[PDB]
Amino acid sequence: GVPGALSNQPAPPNEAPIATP
Amino acid sequence: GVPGALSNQPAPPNEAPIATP
Amino acid sequence: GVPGALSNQPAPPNEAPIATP
Amino acid sequence: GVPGALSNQPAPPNEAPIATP
Amino acid sequence: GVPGALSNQPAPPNEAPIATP
Amino acid sequence: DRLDAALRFQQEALNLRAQRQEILAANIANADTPGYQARDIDFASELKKVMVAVDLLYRVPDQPSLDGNTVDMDRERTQFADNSLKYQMGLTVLGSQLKGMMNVLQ
Amino acid sequence: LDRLDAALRFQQEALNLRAQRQEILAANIANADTPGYQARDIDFASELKKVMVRAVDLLYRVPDQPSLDGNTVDMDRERTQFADNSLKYQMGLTVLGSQLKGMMNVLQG
Amino acid sequence: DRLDAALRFQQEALNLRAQRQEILAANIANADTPGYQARDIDFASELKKVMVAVDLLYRVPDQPSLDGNTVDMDRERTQFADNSLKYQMGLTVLGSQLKGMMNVLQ
Amino acid sequence: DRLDAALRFQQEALNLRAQRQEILAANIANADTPGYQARDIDFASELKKVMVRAVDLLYRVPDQPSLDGNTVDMDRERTQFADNSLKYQMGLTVLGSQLKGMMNVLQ
Amino acid sequence: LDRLDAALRFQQEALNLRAQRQEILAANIANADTPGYQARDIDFASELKKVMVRAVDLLYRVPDQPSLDGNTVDMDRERTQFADNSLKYQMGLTVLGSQLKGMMNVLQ
Amino acid sequence: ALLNIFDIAGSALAAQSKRLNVAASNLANADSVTGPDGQPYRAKQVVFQVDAAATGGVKVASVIESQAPEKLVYEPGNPLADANGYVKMPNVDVVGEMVNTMSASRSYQANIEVLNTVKSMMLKTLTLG
Amino acid sequence: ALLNIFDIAGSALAAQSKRLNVAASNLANADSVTGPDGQPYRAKQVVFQVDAAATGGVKVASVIESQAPEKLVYEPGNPLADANGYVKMPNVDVVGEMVNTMSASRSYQANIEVLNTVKSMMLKTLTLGQ
Amino acid sequence: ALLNIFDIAGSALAAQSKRLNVAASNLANADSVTGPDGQPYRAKQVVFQVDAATGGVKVASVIESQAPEKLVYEPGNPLADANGYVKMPNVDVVGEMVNTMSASRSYQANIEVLNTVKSMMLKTLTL
Amino acid sequence: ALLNIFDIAGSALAAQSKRLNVAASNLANADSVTGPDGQPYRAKQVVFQVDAAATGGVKVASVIESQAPEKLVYEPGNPLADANGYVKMPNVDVVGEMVNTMSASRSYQANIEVLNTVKSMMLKTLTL
Amino acid sequence: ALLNIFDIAGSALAAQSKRLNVAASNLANADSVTGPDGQPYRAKQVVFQVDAQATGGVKVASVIESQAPEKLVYEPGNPLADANGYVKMPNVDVVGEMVNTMSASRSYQANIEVLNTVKSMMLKTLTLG
Amino acid sequence: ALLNIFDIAGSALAAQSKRLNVAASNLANADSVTGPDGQPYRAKQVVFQVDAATGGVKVASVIESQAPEKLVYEPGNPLADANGYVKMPNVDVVGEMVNTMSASRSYQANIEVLNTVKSMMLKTLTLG
């Protein structure tokens, strides 16, 4: 939820697609 | 009274006006 | 081994050849 | 006498005139 | 002899002549 | 016994503060490694459970990064300062309590 | 009401006066930022004489220099008075303790 | 002699800490001498041998250097700080033990 | 008289140290006022006079002129103040040792 | 001498020599800028051994690097000397204090 | 009894802490706009009163919004713009807030020093005998 | 609690960092075009709000796209050109972004100086607990 | 005795505080050409005195400086005289800058003296 | 559990120093036509790792040459040129190296401050 | 004796203060071509001396003007010009003055610290036992 | 031995001071054309060695660097040789500008070492 809080699961990995698939 | 001494009467309030009437 | 650890025999000499023979 | 010592007589005043009369 | 040691012989004076006579 | 019970809470608070300090140091030292997730522990729940290894959970990311790292320097620094000050306070409280317990014997 | 009582009361009431003056100094240094505050202090000699002859009337200190907010506490002078009063209280305490120890030592053997 | 041994454990720990501090100071002072080899000792094994004439080992280099100097700076500075802290810890432990032994005779 | 005089020597030395300290503090606090002359008391001669007995203070020679007429030099005054404080504490320690020995004799 | 001074003569002489050596070090610190000055020091060990038999001679300090003005008082070497001299003075002070406290405590 | 100094100094410390907190919040939200539910942020000040129960310590009566004129910035390109395209900006004086912070810090330190001095004197009274 | 000061300052620092990052991203994308899936790039801003716990810290609810019209540049040679042969260039105010960066830096420094002072005060506080 | 030291140091601290306040006021009003009654602002300085032998310092009075008032030419302001000259304050800047530093240093020296004397008196108390 | 802080901070310091050295080497050899053997210079960079025996300090695994294709310029009157008269030049991003140096320096400072604070607490711990 | 350290350090401080004042006056009057009697300003420096045996503090013997030739410029307009129109001005090496100031400050700090250390040692040995 | 730290750090201080003086002298004489007897100025360097296992650092000697003189053509000069090539000092500038900084940093580091060792020695002086 609010950034900086505690979560039990990792966030999904980040990606920066140059062009949409 | 001389500064820093004791006295029996309170000092008058300070006004500091911007400009006298 | 890992840098900063301890080992029995000293490091070999370091050389900077200008051109490999 | 030597600076920092004790003497009975006082010190004459120091004058630094701009121009000699 | 070694710098920083104690010797009873005072060091000779140091001089820096501009030109050798 | 009674002596250990009088100091158990303060000692455990000190130990948990030290462990959280180590976690903060680790996840501020790994600030450049991609794919590394920020870590920290829930201090209140950990202290209550221990007074009744160590459980740690990931931190909610602040802003996305392409590499994958999810550590925020200012947030880590504020948490570090808070934990350091609270550790110092706990040490002071423990020292004062021990000094009083020693003084009662004269 | 004879002997020991008064002989130690002359110092006990002095200590009480020092403690009350210390409390007043602490109050007027803690209230040093409230606008329109008046510095409060008492004349120790007159108060001690009046107490010994047998509620204390507190006088107002003349301001050193004016301020718009109306506060008249002077921080450095208040700190100096606080330190002086603390030292005087310690001196009274130690002289009282030495006198009492000297009195008690007589009741030996 | 029982007192001798009981304080001897900590006394030897302190002595080895002092020796390691001296070696660290030496390799700090000679940090810019070309053709120098970083030297250090293994505290745990050395203490075990002394409890049951000191040998020193060459520190593993981390980066090459043309002038033949292998003594790093950051790693040995952290080692210096750690050794100083542990020397102080040993000193205060020995002092506490000695004072506890002394105050019984009062 | 016996105990009185034996303690009186050190008591007078301590009192003279205190008065010299007062003078030094006065002329240090007054170090930034034009027309002021630094004052001091000859401690040795004054103590010798008092021992066989209202102090005769005398001016201090300046070291470098100032236009405003101030002769107090802060560094010299600070050194003298430190020296006087150390002497005062030394005299206090000696007096305390003598008194403690006298008290312990009676035990 | 006496049985009491026999024990503490060594420590007293060490303290006095430390005081004199510190005085000489302070003197050559204060004269750091006077040209033509030569740093002076005391051979502490030899002087202590000579004194513990029954003024103190001065030995010139070898210049570190030459200077034009003729001054030969170094700064870093003498500062380290002053620091270590003060440290050993405090060590001797606490050793003598411990000895005196033990002697007093024996008599209680 | 010399013990009421602890209460007086504790009240003073609480008041100074609250004043410092308010000043810090004002400094942090100096540039903030459009607070929750749309009302723009307004600079807040505290009020010190004497907790008489003669003379005594200082307490905080409440917190009051300053009545200084509220700043306006001309930015029609913003959904918060009014009929004249003005976005409301809080009336925060950075110099005033910093001076308040410094004065609060100094007063807090002075009061804790007073507390330590009174503690030492009371311990001396305890060890009078 | 005398400890929410750290939370307030940390929230202020995080908000200022977010705003600076948004400004830097806009400056980087000042003259970009045809982002992913072909939609033209649009500038974004952030909105600060206070956390009514009274007095509270600052937060950023969400990033809001600018409603200022995009620049329409005539260039039919680009496949993005519409029936009028126009391409949509992003709206970036360079002076506005410079001012925003300056303000963010100044607020960040002020908050760090407040944190320094309060940390000194809190360190001095514990000396009375003995 | 040593009780007079507290009085002397307190007087010195008060005098230095007054000097510092005067310097700060001059620096603040260094560029304020008007007054509430229309008179131009004029630099002010304190006068020191010795309060009777030796003793502490006291501030006898604050007096206006007699240095000539710098005046500039602008007919727009109603304050201008018949020749269009208005009177800026004749307050130096570097003088006040060094006065602030000197006052602060003297203040620190006096408080250090006071603290030293207090410590000496405390040590004397346990004779 | 407080003596591992020194190890973690020292590992971070060493890793940052290695990264700074690599960046400096790239900046120095930005325009190196050839090495000793004859092969063109290729940009290098470190690969960090988590030094967990569970999290701990950072650790440099190895150094790898960038997989980006090296640049090539036309110069037929040079014996290093191939059959097409193209001589290979290293692919170094000067701005990348600059910002790497900046970030490495800042992280170095942060780790120094962490180590200093932890040393102060450890020092004050013994006063129990 | 160790009580001589106080006078030695005081002499060092006085000498360094006089040297610094001389350098500051030279810097201030580096470009002052006149005197109260018409004599052009001439650079001056102090002379150090030792006092006793053979090892003691530094004593400033006197202050002497330099004998280096003085710069002179061609300005027939000024009445101070001689028959050839050459008016004499002080010869001060500004670099020399800056370095003198720095060295005097460093020596001042060193002597202050030495005095502080000796005072602390004396105060600590005052309670032997 | 914890006393040896003093004469280790003093040796380090002396060596670094000598190195700094040599660098300053070279920078000052970077453009001097002749000596007292027509001998061109030559850049000088110090030789560091261990006192001896290992110990402090001592300056073995000072040696003039053996590099060709950057000779320049001034035919109308008395010092010119048969071909009119006078000899100039072979002193660079970056070398000394970096030597001064390195020597200052090492000097400061040894000062810190001496401070810490003196503090811990004084703390050991009051055991129990």
How is the topology of this model organized?
The structure holds 16 chains of a larger assembly.
Chain A: E1 6-7
Chain F: H1 2-29, E1 39-40, H2 43-51, E2 57-59, H3 73-103
Antiparallel strand pairs in F: 1-2
Helix pairs in contact in F: 1-2, 1-3
Chain K: H1 4-28, E1 44-50, E2 58-65, E3 71-74, E4 86-89, H2 94-126
Antiparallel strand pairs in K: 1-2, 3-4
Pfam families (chain P): Flg_bb_rod, Flg_bbr_C
Subcellular location (chain P): Bacterial flagellum basal body
Organism (chain P): Salmonella typhimurium (strain LT2 / SGSC1412 / ATCC 700720)
Largest interface: K-L, 31 and 34 residues
Q: How does the overall form of chain F come out from the CA principal axes? A: elongated
Describe the sheet with the most strands of chain F: 2 strands, antiparallel
What's the helical proportion of residues of chain F? 55-70%
Q: Terminal Cα separation of chain K, in Å?
A: 18 Å
- How helix-rich are the residues of chain K, as a percent range? 40-55%
Which radius of gyration of chain K do the C-alpha atoms yield? 21 Å
Strand order of the largest sheet of chain F: 1-2
What pattern of helices and strands is seen along the backbone of chain K?
HEEEEH
Protein name (chain I): Flagellar basal body rod protein FlgB
Subcellular location (chain I): Bacterial flagellum basal body
Keywords (chain I): Bacterial flagellum
Main location (chain I): other
Overview of this protein structure:
The structure holds 16 chains of a larger assembly. Chain A has no helices and one strand. Chain A has 21 residues and is low in regular secondary structure. By secondary structure, chain F is mostly helical. Chain F has one domain (2-103). Helix content of chain F is 64%, strand content 5%. The two termini of chain F are 22 Å apart. In chain K, helix 1 (4-28) runs antiparallel to helix 2 (94-126). A two-stranded antiparallel ribbon of chain K has the order 1-2. In chain K, strands 3-4 form a two-stranded antiparallel ribbon. By secondary structure, chain K is of the alpha+beta class. Chain K has one domain. Chain K contains two helices and four strands. Chain K starts with a helix and ends with a helix. Helix content of chain K is 45%, strand content 18%. The K-L interface holds K 17, 20-22, 24-25, 27-36, 41, 44, 63, 77, 79, 94, 101-102, 105, 108-109, 112, 115-116, 119 and L 2, 4-5, 8-9, 11-12, 47-52, 54-58, 66-68, 103, 107, 110-111, 114, 117-118, 120-121, 124-125, 127-128. The PDB classes it as motor protein. Keywords: Proximal rod, FlgC, FlgB, FliF, motor protein.
